[PDB]
């Protein structure tokens, strides 16, 4: 429960927008820095942060392409930025890079990886907690540009530090702060290019519970798709109000509980928090059970692997009224379901 304890994707990292017919995650140099400052927390705090000892939540907008409960490991996804090329007359004057002819940013395919420059523990992780938010960040390649920005050589924080580290890491290919010809130039705008991203989750034989993150922006939301691979455990999943790409690969004796309380009612967002409205009358009209598929409302759950008596019965659950927990018990084998109240 406590779908209210969990923040909305983008609360910390920021939500990208369209300002001039272009996706822009940040628009002021100062503010760009803070984002990096934010990104850097994966080193400082770790991959996962704990909400109240109970819920493991990945860092906001941290691209994770794999969670493996067998290895206790994760794999980071693509987080790159456009490389520079062709400075002339470079010096280091007063800790600030100087140039006669300023370097040019370019979209040409060799891109620099931000994540590579990061020191993160992605192995021997502590995934003991039963409660875990699924990642909310798709693969991206940041465009950017600089602009003449006086008086920001004073700027120093975990953000400027990471930015500096990227410069040093990719010698003569990245300069976020520099003086050229007349005045000081700084990266002013972060312009992401999100990409289709399949997050893979390899499950152990334990009991695990997953909350789909609430991602309001539709565009970003639909770049993601989760692929679960069960191995004979007990798996719980709270769907968001949003129809998300979910594929479940079935192992022998896989028991799946899918909370659909966000599917069967209208859900809105009021003060940057979920707001559960009234149950859709004739919600069962929207329920379609096909061979290796559950369609409820417009949400889709695809199924792969061996379907039999050990793993064919998946339990969709929500609350028909305040104090009535209903279970839609779907039989994948016979494309039939039934209705209980416990």
């Amino acid at each position: 429960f406590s779908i209210l304890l969990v923040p909305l994707a983008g609360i910390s990292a920021g939500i990208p927008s369209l300002v001039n017919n272009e996706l822009v995650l940040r628009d002021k140099a100062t503010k760009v820095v803070d984002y990096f400052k934010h990104v850097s927390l994966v080193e400082t705090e770790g991959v996962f942060t704990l909400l109240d000892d109970k819920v493991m939540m990945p860092q906001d907008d941290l691209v994770i392409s794999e969670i493996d409960f067998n290895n206790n490991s994760i794999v980071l996804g693509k987080c790159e930025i456009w490389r520079m090329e062709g400075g002339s007359g470079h010096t280091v004057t007063d800790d600030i890079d100087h140039f006669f002819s300023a370097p040019s940013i370019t979209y040409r395919e060799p891109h620099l990886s931000i994540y590579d420059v990061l020191e993160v523990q992605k192995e021997e992780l502590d995934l003991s907690k039963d409660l875990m938010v699924l990642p909310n960040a798709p693969n991206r390649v940041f465009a950017w540009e600089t602009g003449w920005t006086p008086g920001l050589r004073s700027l120093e924080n975990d953000g400027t530090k990471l930015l500096d580290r990227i410069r040093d890491n990719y010698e003569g290919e990245f300069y976020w702060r520099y003086f050229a010809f007349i005045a000081d130039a700084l990266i002013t705008t972060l312009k992401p290019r999100y990409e289709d991203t399949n997050i893979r989750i390899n499950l152990d034989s334990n009991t695990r519970s997953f909350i789909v993150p609430i991602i309001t922006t539709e565009y970003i939301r639909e770049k993601l798709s989760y692929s679960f691979y069960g191995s004979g455990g007990t798996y719980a999943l709270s769907l968001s109000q949003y129809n998300m790409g979910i594929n479940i690969e079935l192992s022998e004796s896989d028991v799946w509980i899918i909370d659909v309380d966000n599917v069967v009612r209208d859900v809105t967002i009021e003060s940057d928090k979920i707001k559960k409205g009234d149950l859709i009358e004739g919600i069962l009209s929207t329920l379609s059970i096909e061979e290796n598929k559950i369609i409820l409302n417009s949400h889709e759950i695809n199924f792969s692997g061996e379907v039999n008596g050990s793993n064919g019965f998946v339990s969709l659950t929500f609350s028909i009224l305040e104090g009535i927990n209903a279970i839609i018990e779907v039989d994948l084998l016979s494309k039939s379901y039934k209705l209980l109240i416990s």
Epitope: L18, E222, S298
Partner: nanobody, 128 residues
Framework: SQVQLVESGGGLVQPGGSLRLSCEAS????????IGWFRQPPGKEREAVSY????????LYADSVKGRFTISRDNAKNAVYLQMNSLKREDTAVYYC????????????????????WGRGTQVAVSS
């Protein structure tokens, strides 16, 4: 005049017929925006018809047109399409194309406050 959503292809057909509506999205990049189709029958409210999300993955139709209408979009050629089949007389309306705001955090997806650009509509009448 920059950002527009011009619809075309409306006219007259006879019950059980079919036609195809066109939306020439102009003056922005609709690879980001989700597009909807709405309609207003004579003397009635504006009505939800179909709604394609940016990138497919969310093709929704109103119960009145399920099975009959089919929605499609060519981001590349910046146009959305609605193929209409088995046209009944109840389908007589003024059909509109509209772009869903990029930031719409509502599952309704037809809320009409979540839409920023609206076309002029094309009328469809159905009578033999």
């Amino acid at each position: 005049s920059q950002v527009q959503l011009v619809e075309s292809g409306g006219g007259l057909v006879q019950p059980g017929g079919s036609l195809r509506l066109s939306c020439e999205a102009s003056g922005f990049t609709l690879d980001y925006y989700g597009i909807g189709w709405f309609r207003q029958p004579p003397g009635k409210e504006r009505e939800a018809v179909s709604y394609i999300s940016a990138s497919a993955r969310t093709i929704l139709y109103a119960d009145s047109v399920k099975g009959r209408f089919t929605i499609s979009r060519d981001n590349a050629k910046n146009a959305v399409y609605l193929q209409m089949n088995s046209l009944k007389r109840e389908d007589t309306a003024v059909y509109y194309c509209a772009r869903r705001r990029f930031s719409a955090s509502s599952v309704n997806r037809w809320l009409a406050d979540d839409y920023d650009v609206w076309g002029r509509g094309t009328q469809v009448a159905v009578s033999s």
